[PDB]
Every structure is written in C-alpha cells, then in structure tokens.
From Swiss-Prot, chains A, B:
Entry domain remark: The integrin I-domain (insert) is a VWFA domain. Integrins with I-domains do not undergo protease cleavage. The I-domain is necessary and sufficient for interaction with ICAM1 and F11R.
Included stretch of the parent chain: 153 to 335 of 1170
Job of this protein: Integrin ITGAL/ITGB2 is a receptor for ICAM1, ICAM2, ICAM3 and ICAM4. Integrin ITGAL/ITGB2 is a receptor for F11R. Integrin ITGAL/ITGB2 is a receptor for the secreted form of ubiquitin-like protein ISG15; the interaction is mediated by ITGAL. Involved in a variety of immune phenomena including leukocyte-endothelial cell interaction, cytotoxic T-cell mediated killing, and antibody dependent killing by granulocytes and monocytes. Contributes to natural killer cell cytotoxicity. Involved in leukocyte adhesion and transmigration of leukocytes including T-cells and neutrophils.
Localisation: Cell membrane
Sugar attachment sites: N36
Organism per entry: Homo sapiens
Name of the protein in question: Integrin alpha-L
Top-rank taxon: Eukaryota
Amino acid sequence: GNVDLVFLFDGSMSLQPDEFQKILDFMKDVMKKLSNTSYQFAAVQFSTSYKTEFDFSDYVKRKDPDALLKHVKHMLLLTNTFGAINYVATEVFREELGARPDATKVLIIITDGEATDSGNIDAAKDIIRYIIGIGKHFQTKESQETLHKFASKPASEFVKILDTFEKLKDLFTELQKKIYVIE
Amino acid sequence: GNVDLVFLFDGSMSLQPDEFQKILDFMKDVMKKLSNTSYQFAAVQFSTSYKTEFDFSDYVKRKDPDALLKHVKHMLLLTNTFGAINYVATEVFREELGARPDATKVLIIITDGEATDSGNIDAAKDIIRYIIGIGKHFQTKESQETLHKFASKPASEFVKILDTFEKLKDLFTELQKKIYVIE
Ligand SMILES: [Cl-]
Ligand SMILES: [Cl-]
Ligand SMILES: [Mn+2]
Ligand SMILES: [Mn+2]
C-alpha cells in the first residue's frame, strides 16, 4: 500500500562537509530510485534541535529530490536523537503536512554518534524504524547497542553499522537488490 | 530472491511502426526502473517464428536496454503464441544463456491478436505468466477469453487488457505503484 517514509539525518558537529554530503546523496539516491512509486518522502535534519527540510506535501508538490534538499545547511551541533525521533512522530507524520492516513510509516535514521540526550521514543514505536550508524564512533559493540532502542526489532535487520561514509554507496547497492514489483 | 524475466513481444503484421515502438518502449521502461536489482532480463520477438533479441548473458554484460534493443527488426508476420511460449521455456531459460538455476521465472507476453497456432504450453507452466492483450482485436469477450490459457491464475491478476498502445504508458505508471523495498 502507501508508504510515508521519513529520513531523519544527523547534522552534528562531527561531520566533515564531504561526509554530510554523502548522507544527502544517499537520501537522494533512494528517492530517485523510488520515484513514481507508492512511497512519499519527508526529511528532517537533527543536531541540537530539529528542522524539517521538506515534508510530505513539499515532496508531492515538487518531487525533485535535488531541489528539495538544495537549501539544507549543516547545523554542526549536538546529537539529540530522542528529541529528534519524537519530533518526527508528532511534528512530521501529520495529515495537514501531507501524511497519508492509513499509510505505513517508515523512519530511516542516519547518525554518526551516540545520542547526547535521553528519555523515550514511545510515541514513535508504531513507525517502522531503521537506523544507520556511521563512522569510528561506532567501532565498539557497546556504542552499536546504544542504537537498538531507536530501531524496530530484531536489531539484525533494522540496525545497520557502516564503518565509513563511503559504505553508504554499498548500502544503496544492497537495498536495490531488495526492490520488487509485488503481485 | 533472484528473478529471471523474459519479455515475449508480438511482431505480427498488424502492428504499425509506432505501435511496435511503444511495445519496445514499455519493455525498456520496465528494465530501466528495475536496473541494479535482483532482476535480469531477456527479450524474445515472436511472429511466425521466434528470435531472442538478447539473452540473460547479454543483459548482464551490457545492462543497457536501449542498446540491447537497437537492432530489433519488426518481423511483420503471423502470431504463433503457443510455439513462442514453448520456445522461451526451452530455448531462453537455459543456464548456459545466463539464466540463474533457481531464480523465479517470469514471462511477460505482449500481443495484439489471437494466436495463429495451437497445441499446449505445459512446458512453460511453472513460469509466472502475464499476458497483455492490446487493441481492436480484443474488443469482444470471446477474443479476450482466448488469452487466459497462456497466463497464470487467476486471469483477473495475470491478464491485462489495453484498449490502445498509448495505454502501455498507463500500465507502466500503474506497475511502479507496486514497487517496494522488501525486508
Ligand atoms: Cl558530534
Ligand atoms: Cl497480425
Ligand atoms: Mn556526530
Ligand atoms: Mn497482430
């Protein structure tokens, strides 16, 4: 059926210009591949606070991915992941913002560091949540587990750990192998 | 998993140059949208006889549909669909020709007239068969009914009827709404 997918990307102080660009490229690639499908998209940059770069209505109005993200500016601040996730659940997934009523909700969280805040993401528990942890900040198994709480279960399918930002290209390659025209 | 898909397109005399071109356009549109996925394609033109325009190996070596179908010459003869389907079953789905051993076999038959031969297609029965009947030769319930025996069950899912070749543009729009990234 319909799929309303939200990209919640890390814009923290740790990211180098090229790394931030690779995150933007990844989001665009998936969007272009899935253009003219039953998917609709929204994008929110998060660091210390949260900013919807374009919401569902924006995408519907102008499907152009490159145009939708042409305005993004790297925040360069903290990594308040609990707040960011709750922000999507209540401020982005809204009918008035273009979200479709009984559409399946999906969240693709991309981050390069552990969350600097805490609390709960209970309000977002019914959204299908994928998280992509990139870079040396996720070298240890300990740091990787910290991401499970944000993603759906099992972690084996929903939590993806990438050692480099270059690997985002590999991940896109792999996701395309999972694309099918369903009966 | 892996999907080996063969397009079997009508090259009969009834087809005008632009109608035959729209059939090719449909095939290429499909292939382009499904590029870099688990799908691999082969195309066979049929009329009085049959011709593999490119096989699975060719597709793999040069994944460019436009380049893959540039030499196609409209046969302009009859409509031997029974023989054609049997040819795909035994002369196209072959590992030496690029077909993957246990990939799901799918056959997309595109035609604008009733078969001019008879027999059976028992040998192609394990292949998921879709048939697209286009035009004036299918304006009666009887003519449309004859297409059923070539496709998988139920006909309501595997038989597609288009009043015009223009409609192949519509059909492609429709099928894309069924494109999803599987878990
Ligand atoms: Cl950081
Ligand atoms: Cl004909
Ligand atoms: Mn960071
Ligand atoms: Mn014909």
